[PDB]
């Protein structure tokens, strides 16, 4: 027969990893605001996301598709002031 | 790649506009600080006539 | 037999209270007909379930928690 | 901040308890392969066995032998455990679903792995029991030799992907798992992961019959807990490396049709259901690998030092260099150099 | 430039004023190469130039082979004498 | 096959006209004269003849003995390598216009004219991008100068051949 | 340019444009709508983009200040095409860019919404999506049927709309 | 919090001075462990300046191999201004430090690569030649 | 050679004036070479920012010696979380 | 019993001996050498018959090789 | 302060906490006989070259393997050119590996009985 007592610890491990990953999916989605995560993001993507923050008012990954930008977009430009690499 | 190429001109153009504004703005700020002193703020440190966005700010 | 079906069938045959008693004393789930009782109070069972190996067809359920 | 904390606690608890229950699963599986039962008495169905051993060992006195560097003897197990657990920060249970989403995830895995020989190298010097010294030198040799095989298989896989992000490597495998075109490479990764973990048959490092106990002869109490925990955590972690390099990580099947039947829009229910599917796929792959470690422990006698060194450096490494030659050749022949 | 320079100079002084052991000598060699490389890499970053990092990679590899050969020399030296009294 | 960088045109490496600044391996072997094959044969014979004569002059173990077949086989192999290197160098030097190259010049003119008639590229089409072609050219140009040190060849169909 | 290192603070400049410079509208779409509309922007504004880049090259270093005018031209062309999409094909445009938001911005995960958006834009704006540089033998991947690579979950709304269009005959 | 990341560079520098404990160690082992600590500090500094991939390569090689060899053998034998960080969009590829190093090393400097192959060949032949007694 | 290649495979930070200076040295001869000393100062300037640091030194020195207020559109520093807020 | 027969004495006999008595080395070498030879011999066959090589991808903005053609449209 | 750094910080704290629990709760009664080193129950150095040699040859081979990381991260960009270069690199290293094999570097009474009648 199939020894179920031998499979109980395997079942415990399997349920633990499965539940942990499911809870991590829900937390990541909740942190993202209802969309999946962005993975393998290059410099281009980081800059696009910064521009998105300038456009949607700092609301994370929220997207706007209006053709014309609000007025504050022209003034909320950011350069970065980086300390001397001694 | 082709999508990114098609987006690059407008994004660049915006960035050039921001560059010109912030470079000029810093020029007037420094000039205003240097009024009353015998120093030329408009003189580039470079010998070519080319536009040179500032590097190296003062710490804020 | 190590099968889960054996355990489910024994648990059904024996009732939930006795299942919990067995899980708290012996660790297995055994279903067998009572044979007798000691002077001390322990109870002895025999089983004819074919899924029981040689030397597991008689067992005892001690009367006290500190069994011996 | 709060969400970060909750994610880390969930992940850490799952990993620690999975390691704890792997020990019980090993005892039970070996037991049933040996016609016996294994732990079924401490806790219902022997489910509290690992915590019983833990508590006992945490109540055990620490003995510091007279000729020993006590600082090194206590800190070596600690660093090996830390690195063994740090290795988990990059393992994804779904697309982007990990504590550390590094573009250098593979390089991080290899580096933290290479930090794994220091427990063996240091304990022999710390114990000063002679059995520990012999075990320590032989182990350091074996571990580095097989780390070479593991690194070489890593490189061969990156030849197909051209990325050091683990999630990307997993995503490229929706077309096919890499264990299909590279079945021989999968066999070698198992044989080498067994050796790199120091498991039987390749348990020469801490083999009780050649050398009593092993490098740990002198380790009582929590230091023994640390070596034990690091060993089983490393077992699971290298099974994880195997999983995402070769078994497609968290990919099981195309559940797009099913989700379109069940749901009609995105919801926390559907995100949770997808998360559970991906995590279940990855965890079932981990379970098969751990079972295989236990199976191989049950089936085979040990190697000798000469035998395993000969294996790694005369049978495995030539084959791997040959594959180094033949994989890019096949890419070139069919014009399939992978893009970034 | 700062961390690398100080590692270089302190390792050099450790090497020269070593009157304790030969292992200290090996270590000062390795750490000097480290400091050289750190200075190099900072300069690479400041210039956004790849030649600096290429030479850093080459130094890494050559320091590897140099360590291998040096330890082999030390072992061959030991084989005749049985003991390193420095 | 459009060049990305400017090259000299019909530059004189010597007293003779330029045929090709960086000839392709197939051309260099294809334009080899019977004298060059004589050079290859002479090296192939000379190297084992050299080892045998050296044994004659000063026997390894006092008493003369003909060198074993392993060493003679070695000898032939390496001698052929030296001969082929020498012959390749001679042909390439003809291509640069350093030695006499009338025959090679005429044959090149004819071959180029035929290729142009067929509509093909004068130097062939490359499976590389132009940047990799310029890099391959800068790696293989005048690499015959280091024949003593390392062997390097042109295997890439690039357009930087220094002609018009 | 390299990304910022150990310690950096972002700082904002409060000055206005110098008043000699003609003002221009800025594109307000974000990454997903922009990536959705990129092919149409290219198809329409290719001459202006090319002119902008040629100006930047010929300026030989003063590009930022000498190439403001056709930069304004580029931005205006982009805003025009985005407005046309917002007026004519808004629902399909939203399908496409929300699908992209869900699929890590991979066009391979939004073929169904992309087919609808492409048909709408071709019919109501006379813009075609096309991949430059392919020989006639090579087939554009976004036109390929039965791809090796498929999304994890076909987007629900996009699947429903696609089946609906297949019924209506628009697609 | 902000002063932490600001002085992070200066902290690695200070710990490096302190760790260079290597010279004063009573036990050469202990000296080798402090060498490993110095290498971890180096990896920390490398990440800070923007070269994390180098932090990982250093961990891989110098700690993973060179420190391991060291220990094996000895068990056996008896500027106040701030820089402006600006964006531009001319880079459409996902090209990082490793990719660029591969590109230049394998095309512009293939010769350096093959000479490094010869150097590693030496690193194999030599140790065999002097640590092994033939016949 | 890798000269001119940035950390991302493009042109490094200081390429443009280096290339201008090479255009000089190509067009001129040894006698005439001093003719574009200016291009070389521009190159070294891009590399090391020395006259720029000097100019910033005089600007800061005079700024800190001033008690009168400054009326010019100022520079504002914001937290990274506050990019695009309001 | 079995012993090395010498490669130079007989090639195919030595290959058979190697394949029977040193399979690890024999097959390591076979797999390693099959790569480059197959590259050289078979890549042109693939190009000729199966499918040609792909068109290169862009690496940077494709600059037009022409003069500015002024322009008229989308102005102030 | 992302999950990465917090987890990295958290792990050693857990290790130290387990160690401190052991120190606080366990008894501690050292005495001379207990402090002796264990060798099968009762109180009580030349090595072979291959021990040295495995360790020493690990470093070149490790460097060879890790020298292919730039290649596999840039395979497409280097095209059929870099391909050939890395073949040559690999073959040159394979030669050293052949030398190692043939010299048997890592490896560690049949006379007849004759009577003078
Ligand atoms: C998959 C593993 C099973 C493969 C072989 C099964 C053979 C078998 O069942 O006959 C036993 C049979 C014993 O004969 P028997 O005891 O007289 O009669 C059996 C009992 O009457 C009846 O025995 P039974 O009632 O146990 O069999 C019915 C069984 C199913 O009966 C079947 O055989 C169905 C066909 C195969 C599907 C297996 C379903 C269960 C999968 C296990 C995981 C469940 C989740 O359904 C169950 O009861 C499942 C067990 C209860 C759940 C276990 C608790 C799981 C906790 C979490 C698990 C997560 C980790 C995993 O042995 C054989 O005939 C020869 C066995 C040779 C196996 C060689 C290799 C097979 C393939 C490799 C498997 C790799 C592991
Ligand atoms: C040399 C003697 C051995 C010749 C073998 C075959 C020669 C041949 O006919 O080529 C036809 C072959 C196909 O002809 P095709 O179909 O008419 O194509 C026309 C154009 O080639 C088409 O050009 P494309 O622009 O359209 O395409 C780019 C080009 C790509 O080409 C490249 O990128 C080559 C650039 C690397 C330069 C290598 C120079 C050699 C350096 C020697 C080591 C230096 C280390 C220095 C250390 C200090 O072609 C390829 O894509 C081929 C990719 C690789 C093919 C397979 C790789 C085989 C490697 C091992 C072969 C072993 C042969 C058997 C044993 C001998 O042309 C090739 O391009 C194949 C590559 C040639 C072999 C590379 C290395 C050969 C062995 C190393 C040199 C050993 C020296 C020994 C003698 C020393 C003096 C006595
Ligand atoms: C791509 C790389 C190609 C590798 C493929 C090599 C085939 C190996 C197959 C094999 O079975 O090896 C048996 C061999 C075992 O032999 P064994 O008899 O068991 O050894 C025990 C005896 O006690 C020991 O007996 P032994 O001491 O007498 O040694 C036996 C022999 C065993 O090794 C071999 O027999 C293999 C040698 C084959 C390669 C030689 C190619 C030469 C091509 C030029 C032809 C020139 C002559 C033409 C005549 C004039 C034509 C009109 O050892 C060698 O001779 C090693 C040869 C090393 C290089 C010598 C060749 C000189 C360089 C030639 C360059 C060519 C330049 C061409 C110019 C450009 C043209 C486009 O295993 C190996 O050789 C290990 C692999 C290393 C190969 C090198
Ligand atoms: C999970 C664990 C659950 C079990 C919790 C407690 C049971 C284990 C307690 C236990 O054996 O220590 C007993 C004390 O006994 C108590 O009465 C000491 C009070 C017991 C403290 C109870 C704390 C419970 C939660 C701990 C977290 C033995 O120490 P002990 O007398 O030699 O006293 C000390 C102690 O062992 C060392 O910390 C000192 O360094 C050493 O000098 C030594 O003298
Ligand atoms: C030791 C443990 C070895 C276990 C290996 C399990 C192998 C079976 C899974 C193969 C997974 C893979 O890489 O490809 C599967 C993939 C699934 O297809 P699908 O779900 O429709 O996704 C569409 C996008 N391709 O596409 C396929 O379905 C292709 C067919 C599956 C791959 C070949 C199956 C036959 C070989 C199985 C032998 C495995 C080792 C023994
Ligand atoms: C430090 C010691 C060694 C560091 C190893 C480097 C590991 C690494 O690769 O860090 C990369 C990671 C950020 O890298 P990246 O992949 O680009 O993140 C993009 C995510 N979208 O980095 C991170 O995500 C977090 C940074 C972790 C290390 C910070 C330690 C600070 C070191 C200063 C110590 C002060 C004394
Ligand atoms: C290629 C790269 C990967 C392999 C690298 C390792 C190669 C090692 C070869 C070697 O060491 O040769 C020595 C060995 C001699 O045998 P042995 O007596 O054991 O010597 C030990 C010394 N005491 O030699 C041997 O006995 C085994 C080596 C046999 C080599 C000849 C095999 C020929 C292969 C033929 C198959 C080709 C496949 C199809 C080819 C198509 C085109 C021809
Ligand atoms: C993370 C958990 C941190 C817990 C570490 C706390 C250590 C407390 C143990 C102690 O008091 O000292 C133990 C140490 C043992 O060494 P010793 O007794 O000198 O010699 C033994 C040779 N058989 O005795 C020592 O030599 C002390 C060395 C460590 C210095 C720390 C001083 C602790 C003082 C207690 C207040
Ligand atoms: C996942 C966790 C699965 C294990 C839980 C069931 C075990 C059980 O609750 O078992 C009952 C335990 C004591 O077990 P026992 O004394 O050995 O009796 C077992 C009977 N015989 C016959 C087998 C001896 O009672 C308790 O105090 C439960 C409190 C423990 C909480 C800590 C759990 C950590 C997770």
Automatic annotation (TrEMBL), chain A:
Its main location: mitochondrion. One of its GO terms (cellular component) is mitochondrial inner membrane. It is a single-pass membrane protein. It is found in: Mitochondrion inner membrane. Keywords: Electron transport, Membrane, Mitochondrion, Mitochondrion inner membrane, Respiratory chain, Transmembrane, Transmembrane helix, Transport. Pfam families: MWFE. The chain crosses the membrane at residues 11-30. Belongs to the complex I NDUFA1 subunit family. Accessory subunit of the mitochondrial membrane respiratory chain NADH dehydrogenase (Complex I), that is believed not to be involved in catalysis. Complex I functions in the transfer of electrons from NADH to the respiratory chain. The immediate electron acceptor for the enzyme is believed to be ubiquinone. This is NADH dehydrogenase [ubiquinone] 1 alpha subcomplex subunit 1.
UniProtKB/TrEMBL annotation, chain B:
Residues 10-37 form a coiled coil. It is found in: Mitochondrion inner membrane. Signal peptide: none annotated. Complex I functions in the transfer of electrons from NADH to the respiratory chain. Accessory subunit of the mitochondrial membrane respiratory chain NADH dehydrogenase (Complex I), that is believed not to be involved in catalysis. Belongs to the complex I NDUFA13 subunit family. This is NADH dehydrogenase [ubiquinone] 1 alpha subcomplex subunit 13. It comes from Yarrowia lipolytica. The chain holds residues 63 to 122 of 123 of the full protein.
Automatic annotation (TrEMBL), chain E:
It is a multi-pass membrane protein. One of its GO terms (cellular component) is mitochondrial inner membrane. It is found in: Mitochondrion inner membrane; Mitochondrion membrane. It catalyses: a ubiquinone + NADH + 5 H(+)(in) = a ubiquinol + NAD(+) + 4 H(+)(out). It is an enzyme of class 7 (translocase). GO terms for biological process: ATP synthesis coupled electron transport. Its EC number is 7.1.1.2. Its main location: mitochondrion. Core subunit of the mitochondrial membrane respiratory chain NADH dehydrogenase (Complex I) that is believed to belong to the minimal assembly required for catalysis. Complex I functions in the transfer of electrons from NADH to the respiratory chain. The immediate electron acceptor for the enzyme is believed to be ubiquinone. Core subunit of the mitochondrial membrane respiratory chain NADH dehydrogenase (Complex I) which catalyzes electron transfer from NADH through the respiratory chain, using ubiquinone as an electron acceptor. This is NADH-ubiquinone oxidoreductase chain 4L. It comes from Yarrowia lipolytica (Candida lipolytica).
Automatic annotation (TrEMBL), chain G:
InterPro entries: CHCH, NDUFA8. Disulfide bonds join 45-77. It holds the Pfam family CHCH. The keyword Protease does not apply. Residues 89-122 form the CHCH domain. Accessory subunit of the mitochondrial membrane respiratory chain NADH dehydrogenase (Complex I), that is believed not to be involved in catalysis. Complex I functions in the transfer of electrons from NADH to the respiratory chain. The immediate electron acceptor for the enzyme is believed to be ubiquinone. This is NADH-ubiquinone oxidoreductase. It comes from Yarrowia lipolytica (Candida lipolytica). The lineage of its organism: Eukaryota, Fungi, Dikarya, Ascomycota, Saccharomycotina.
């Amino acid at each position: 027969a199939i020894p179920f007592e031998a499979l109980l610890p395997y079942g415990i491990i399997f349920g633990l990893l499965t539940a942990g990953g499911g809870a991590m999916q829900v937390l990541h989605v909740y942190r993202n605001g209802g969309v999946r995560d962005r993975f393998a993001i290059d410099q281009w993507d980081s800059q696009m996301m910064e521009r998105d923050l300038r456009l949607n008012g700092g609301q994370g990954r929220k997207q706007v598709d209006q053709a014309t930008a609000p007025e504050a977009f022209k003034h909320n430009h950011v350069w970065k002031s980086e300390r001397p690499l001694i | 790649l082709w999508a990114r190429i098609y987006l690059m001109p407008l994004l660049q153009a915006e960035e050039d506009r921001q560059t010109v504004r912030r470079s000029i703005a810093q020029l007037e700020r420094e000039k205003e600080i240097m009024k009353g002193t015998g120093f030329d703020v408009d003189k580039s440190v470079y010998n070519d006539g080319k536009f040179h966005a500032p590097a190296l700010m003062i710490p804020p | 037999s190590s099968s889960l079906y054996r355990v489910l069938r024994n648990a059904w045959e024996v009732g939930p209270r006795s299942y919990w008693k067995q899980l708290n004393s012996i660790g297995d789930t055994k279903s067998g007909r009572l044979v007798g009782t000691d002077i001390y109070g322990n109870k002895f069972y025999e089983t004819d379930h074919q899924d029981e190996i040689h030397l597991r067809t008689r067992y005892v359920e001690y009367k006290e928690k500190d069994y011996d | 901040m709060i969400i970060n904390i909750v994610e880390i606690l969930i992940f850490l608890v799952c990993v620690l308890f999975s390691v704890a229950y792997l020990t019980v699963a090993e005892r039970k599986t070996l037991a049933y392969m040996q016609r016996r039962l294994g732990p079924n008495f401490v806790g219902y169905y022997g489910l509290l066995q690992a915590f019983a051993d833990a508590v006992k060992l945490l109540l055990k006195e620490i003995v510091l032998p007279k000729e020993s560097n006590y600082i090194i003897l206590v800190i070596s197990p600690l660093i090996t455990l830390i690195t063994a657990l740090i290795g988990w920060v990059v393992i994804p249970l779904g697309p982007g679903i990990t504590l550390g989403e590094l573009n250098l995830g593979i390089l991080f895995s290899l580096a933290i792995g290479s930090l794994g020989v220091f427990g063996s190298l240091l304990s022999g010097w710390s114990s000063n029991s002679k059995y520990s010294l012999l075990g320590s030198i032989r182990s350091t040799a074996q571990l580095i030799s097989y780390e070479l095989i593991l690194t070489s298989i890593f490189i061969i896989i990156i030849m197909f992907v051209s990325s050091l992000n683990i999630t990307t490597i997993i995503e490229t495998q929706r077309v096919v798992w890499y264990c299909i075109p590279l079945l021989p490479l999968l066999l070698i990764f198992f044989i080498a992961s067994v050796a790199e973990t120091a498991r039987p048959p390749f348990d020469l490092t801490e083999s009780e019959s050649e050398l009593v106990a092993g490098y740990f002869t002198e380790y009582s109490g929590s230091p023994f807990v640390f070596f034990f925990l690091a060993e089983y955590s490393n077992i699971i972690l290298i099974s994880a490396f195997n999983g995402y390099l070769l078994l497609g990580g968290y990919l099981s099947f195309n559940y797009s049709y099913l989700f379109n039947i069940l749901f009609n829009d995105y919801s926390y229910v559907s995100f949770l259901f997808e998360g559970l599917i991906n995590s279940s796929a990855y965890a079932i792959k981990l379970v098969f690998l751990m079972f295989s470690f236990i199976w191989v422990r049950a089936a085979f006698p040990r190697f000798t030092y000469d035998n395993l060194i000969n294996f790694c450096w005369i049978i495995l490494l030539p084959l791997l260099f040959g594959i180094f030659l033949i994989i890019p050749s096949t890419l070139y022949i069919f014009d399939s150099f992978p893009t970034l | 430039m700062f961390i690398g320079t100080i590692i270089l100079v302190l390792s050099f002084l450790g090497f020269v004023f070593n009157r304790r052991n030969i292992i200290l000598a090996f270590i000062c060699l390795e750490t000097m190469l480290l400091g050289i490389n750190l200075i190099l890499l900072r300069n690479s970053v400041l210039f956004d130039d790849i030649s600096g990092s290429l030479f850093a990679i080459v130094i890494i590899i050559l320091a590897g082979v140099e360590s291998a050969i040096g330890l082999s020399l030390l072992v061959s030296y030991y084989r005749l004498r049985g003991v390193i009294n420095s | 096959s459009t060049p990305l960088v400017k090259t000299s045109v019909n530059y004189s490496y010597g007293d003779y006209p330029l045929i090709d600044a960086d000839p392709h391996f197939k051309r260099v072997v294809g334009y080899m004269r019977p004298s060059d094959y004589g050079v290859i044969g002479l090296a192939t014979a000379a190297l084992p003849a050299g080892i045998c004569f050296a044994e004659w002059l000063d026997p390894v173990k006092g008493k003369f003995a003909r060198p074993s077949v392993k060493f003679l086989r070695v000898a032939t192999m390496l001698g052929f390598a030296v001969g082929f290197g020498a012959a390749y160098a001679r042909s390439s030097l003809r291509f640069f216009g350093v030695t006499e190259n009338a025959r090679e010049y005429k044959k090149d003119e004819a071959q180029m004219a035929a290729r142009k008639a067929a509509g093909l590229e004068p130097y062939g089409t490359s499976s590389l991008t132009p940047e990799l072609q310029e890099i391959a050219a800068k790696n293989s140009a005048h690499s015959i100068a280091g024949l003593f040190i390392f062997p390097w060849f042109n295997f890439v169909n690039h357009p930087y051949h220094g002609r018009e | 340019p390299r990304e910022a290192a150990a310690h950096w603070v972002p700082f904002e400049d409060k000055a206005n444009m110098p008043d000699n410079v003609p003002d221009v509208v800025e594109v307000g779409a974000t990454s997903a709508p922009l990536l959705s509309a990129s092919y149409f922007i290219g198809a329409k504004c290719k001459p202006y983009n090319d002119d902008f880049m040629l100006c930047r090259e010929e300026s030989q270093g003063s590009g930022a200040i000498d190439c403001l005018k056709e930069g304004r031209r580029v931005t205006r062309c982009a805003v025009s095409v985005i407005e046309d999409i917002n007026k004519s094909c808004l629902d399909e445009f939203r399908l496409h860019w929300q699908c992209l938001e869900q699929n890590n911005h991979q066009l391979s995960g939004c073929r169904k919404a992309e087919a609808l958006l492409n048909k709408c834009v071709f019919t109501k704006l006379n813009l075609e999506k096309k991949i430059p540089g392919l020989r006639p033998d090579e087939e554009p991947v976004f036109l390929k049927k039965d791809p090796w690579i498929k999304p994890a979950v076909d987007d629900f709304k996009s699947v429903r709309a696609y089946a609906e269009a297949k019924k209506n005959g628009t697609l | 919090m902000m002063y932490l990341t600001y002085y992070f560079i200066e902290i690695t520098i200070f710990l490096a001075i302190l760790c260079t404990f290597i010279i004063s160690a009573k036990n050469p082992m202990v000296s080798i462990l402090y060498m490993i600590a110095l290498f971890v500090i180096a990896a920390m500094y490398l990440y800070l300046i923007g070269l994390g991939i180098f932090s990982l390569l250093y961990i891989m090689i110098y700690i993973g191999a060179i420190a391991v060899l060291f220990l094996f053998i000895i068990t056996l034998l008896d500027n106040d201004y701030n820089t402006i960080i600006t964006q531009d969009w001319f880079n459409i590829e996902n090209t990082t430090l490793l990719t660029t190093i591969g590109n230049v090393l394998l095309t512009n400097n293939a010769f350096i690569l093959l000479v490094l192959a010869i150097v590693l060949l030496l690193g194999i032949i030599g140790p065999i030649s002097i640590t092994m007694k033939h016949k | 050679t890798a000269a001119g290649i940035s950390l991302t495979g493009g042109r490094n930070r200081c390429f443009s004036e280096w290339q201008s200076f090479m255009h000089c040295t190509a067009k001129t001869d040894a006698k005439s070479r001093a003719q574009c000393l200016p291009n070389f100062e521009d190159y070294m300037e891009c590399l090391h920012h020395t006259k720029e640091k000097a100019r910033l030194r005089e600007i800061e020195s005079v700024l800190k010696q001033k008690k009168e207020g400054l009326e010019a559109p100022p520079v504002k520093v914001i937290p990274v979380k506050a990019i695009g807020l309001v | 019993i079995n012993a090395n027969p010498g490669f130079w004495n007989g090639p195919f006999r030595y290959l058979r001996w190697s394949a029977h008595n040193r399979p690890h080395l024999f097959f390591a070498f076979a797999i390693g050498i099959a790569g480059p030879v197959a590259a050289l011999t078979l890549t042109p066959l693939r190009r000729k018959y199966l499918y040609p090589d792909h068109s290169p991808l862009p690496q940077s903005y494709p600059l037009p090789q022409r003069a500015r053609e002024q322009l008229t449209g989308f102005d102030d | 302060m992302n999950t990465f750094i917090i987890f990295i910080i958290l792990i050693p704290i857990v290790g130290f906490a387990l160690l401190a629990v052991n120190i606080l709760l366990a008894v501690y009664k050292p005495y001379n006989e207990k402090l002796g080193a264990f060798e099968c129950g009762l109180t009580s150095l030349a090595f072979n070259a291959a021990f040295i040699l495995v360790a020493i040859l690990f470093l070149p081979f490790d460097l060879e393997i890790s020298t292919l990381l730039p290649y596999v991260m840039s395979i497409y960009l280097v095209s059929n050119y870099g391909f050939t270069i890395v073949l040559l690199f690999l073959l040159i290293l394979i030669i050293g590996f052949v030398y190692e094999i043939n010299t048997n570097a890592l490896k560690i009474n049949t006379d007849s009985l004759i009577y003078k009648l």
